[PDB]
Scaffold this active site. Structure first.
Site, mmCIF file in Angstrom:
data_model
loop_
_atom_site.group_PDB
_atom_site.id
_atom_site.type_symbol
_atom_site.label_atom_id
_atom_site.label_comp_id
_atom_site.label_asym_id
_atom_site.label_seq_id
_atom_site.Cartn_x
_atom_site.Cartn_y
_atom_site.Cartn_z
ATOM 1 N N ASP A 113 12.312 -31.491 17.197
ATOM 2 C CA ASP A 113 11.972 -32.889 16.903
ATOM 3 C C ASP A 113 11.881 -33.128 15.460
ATOM 4 O OD1 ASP A 113 11.444 -35.522 17.786
ATOM 5 O OD2 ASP A 113 9.288 -35.227 18.038
ATOM 6 N N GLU A 154 -2.898 -40.374 13.941
ATOM 7 C CA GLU A 154 -3.119 -40.453 15.383
ATOM 8 C C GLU A 154 -1.848 -39.981 16.098
ATOM 9 N N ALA A 192 0.138 -38.521 19.936
ATOM 10 C CA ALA A 192 0.231 -39.035 21.305
ATOM 11 C C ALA A 192 -1.051 -38.717 22.024
ATOM 12 C CB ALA A 192 1.380 -38.413 22.053
ATOM 13 N N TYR A 193 -1.417 -37.448 21.955
ATOM 14 C CA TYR A 193 -2.665 -36.962 22.530
ATOM 15 C C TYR A 193 -3.395 -36.231 21.432
HETATM 16 N N1 ANP Z 1 -1.274 -30.942 8.457
HETATM 17 C C1 ANP Z 1 -1.399 -32.272 8.206
HETATM 18 N N2 ANP Z 1 -1.804 -32.805 7.073
HETATM 19 C C2 ANP Z 1 -1.946 -34.172 6.882
HETATM 20 N N3 ANP Z 1 -1.620 -35.095 7.842
HETATM 21 C C3 ANP Z 1 -1.234 -34.620 9.009
HETATM 22 C C4 ANP Z 1 -1.121 -33.204 9.273
HETATM 23 N N4 ANP Z 1 -0.706 -33.012 10.547
HETATM 24 C C5 ANP Z 1 -0.536 -34.240 11.031
HETATM 25 N N5 ANP Z 1 -0.882 -35.187 10.151
HETATM 26 C C6 ANP Z 1 -0.880 -36.616 10.379
HETATM 27 O O1 ANP Z 1 -1.365 -36.864 11.726
HETATM 28 C C7 ANP Z 1 -0.315 -37.515 12.477
HETATM 29 C C8 ANP Z 1 -0.260 -37.213 13.972
HETATM 30 O O2 ANP Z 1 -0.309 -35.816 14.221
HETATM 31 P P1 ANP Z 1 0.596 -34.912 15.179
HETATM 32 O O3 ANP Z 1 -0.145 -35.026 16.499
HETATM 33 O O4 ANP Z 1 0.866 -33.485 14.732
HETATM 34 O O5 ANP Z 1 1.902 -35.853 15.108
HETATM 35 P P2 ANP Z 1 2.257 -36.920 16.307
HETATM 36 O O6 ANP Z 1 2.610 -38.245 15.625
HETATM 37 O O7 ANP Z 1 1.198 -36.983 17.364
HETATM 38 N N6 ANP Z 1 3.443 -36.137 17.289
HETATM 39 P P3 ANP Z 1 2.883 -35.306 18.723
HETATM 40 O O8 ANP Z 1 1.774 -34.293 18.473
HETATM 41 O O9 ANP Z 1 4.179 -34.674 19.180
HETATM 42 O O10 ANP Z 1 2.367 -36.468 19.540
HETATM 43 C C9 ANP Z 1 0.968 -37.054 11.785
HETATM 44 O O11 ANP Z 1 2.062 -37.947 11.981
HETATM 45 C C10 ANP Z 1 0.579 -37.001 10.332
HETATM 46 O O12 ANP Z 1 0.686 -38.249 9.699
#
Ligand code: ANP
Length: 261
Positions: free
Chosen positions: A120, A13, A15-16
């Protein structure tokens, strides 16, 4: 579920927007899809994403917009994140930390070489594949810092405070590459000690003052062996012009120490 892909389970999950496991009905291929609902941000993000082609960077497969939801299809990293391999207060075995640092440097030299800064870098954004290869993920703050061979200075304050370089809090404008180098040093500290050294690299922070006064008998430093600590001393240098560059990290003694079978 989305065109030929079935969305099968939640992987995380953001942020958005959530990330799901997606499996192709015809080919059986499993990828990840980031689902997003500040709309110009994703257009920039997509554009950077199409540039990425390296074994230590998450690959972008494409996108589809249906209604107001954008689907970003990308390489699946099924080993979770580097954050899960770091034991609190302990870190991880030095050989494993060195291997991940070598992979991290490989991905960051790659990004820098195409003129992209990540902005980041931290263990939650460093995902692992099923053979524990590191993949730099999350291009939501990434930007271009070099175009037609001309560097542009950055001015936007962004990132995550414990990982951010001190110039980003102090300077009107600053060079991109030493900021990403700095965050890699905080990553290496976390991997070797299982703890972050400071809330933020400001003179108001006692733990940051203590490092600048070389009190390495304190935690986290006292948990780190002399050889990687000497590298951290060259990375975590306040003046970004005096900070070590990646070419010189690659000449460091610990970087080049044989440790892992
Ligand atoms: N390509 C991938 N393969 C497997 N898990 C993933 C992948 N991309 C993201 N995730 C998981 O999904 C989570 C959230 O996705 P992502 O939105 O890219 O990171 P986030 O924590 O939201 N940072 P942000 O997008 O800056 O808010 C990540 O922290 C990973 O644990």
């Amino acid at each position: 579920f989305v065109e030929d892909w079935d969305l099968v389970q939640t992987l995380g999950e953001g942020a958005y927007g959530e990330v799901q496991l997606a499996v192709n009905r015809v080919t059986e291929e499993a990828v990840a899809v980031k689902i997003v609902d500040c709309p110009e941000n994703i257009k920039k993000e997509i554009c950077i994403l199409k540039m990425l082609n390296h074994e230590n960077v998450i690959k972008f497969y494409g996108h589809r917009r249906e209604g107001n939801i954008q689907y970003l299809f990308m390489e699946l990293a099924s080993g979770g994140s580097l954050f899960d391999r770091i034991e609190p207060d302990i870190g991880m075995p030095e050989p494993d930390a060195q291997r991940f640092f070598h992979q991290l440097m490989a991905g960051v030299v790659y990004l820098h070489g195409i003129g992209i800064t990540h902005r980041d870098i931290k263990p939650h954004n460093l995902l692992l594949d099923e053979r524990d290869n590191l993949k730099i993920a999350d291009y939501s703050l990434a930007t271009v810092f070099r175009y037609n061979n001309r560097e542009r200075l950055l001015n936007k304050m962004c990132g995550t405070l414990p990982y951010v370089a001190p110039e980003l809090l102090k300077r009107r404008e600053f060079h991109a590459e030493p900021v990403d180098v700095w965050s890699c040093g905080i990553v290496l500290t976390a991997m070797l000690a299982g703890e972050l050294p400071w809330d933020q690299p400001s003179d108001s922070c006692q733990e940051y003052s203590d490092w600048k006064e070389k009190k390495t008998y304190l935690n986290p430093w006292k948990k780190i062996d002399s050889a990687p600590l000497a590298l951290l001393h060259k990375i975590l240098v306040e003046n970004p012009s005096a900070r070590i560059t990646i070419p010189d990290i690659k000449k460091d003694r610990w970087y080049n120490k044989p440790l892992k079978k």
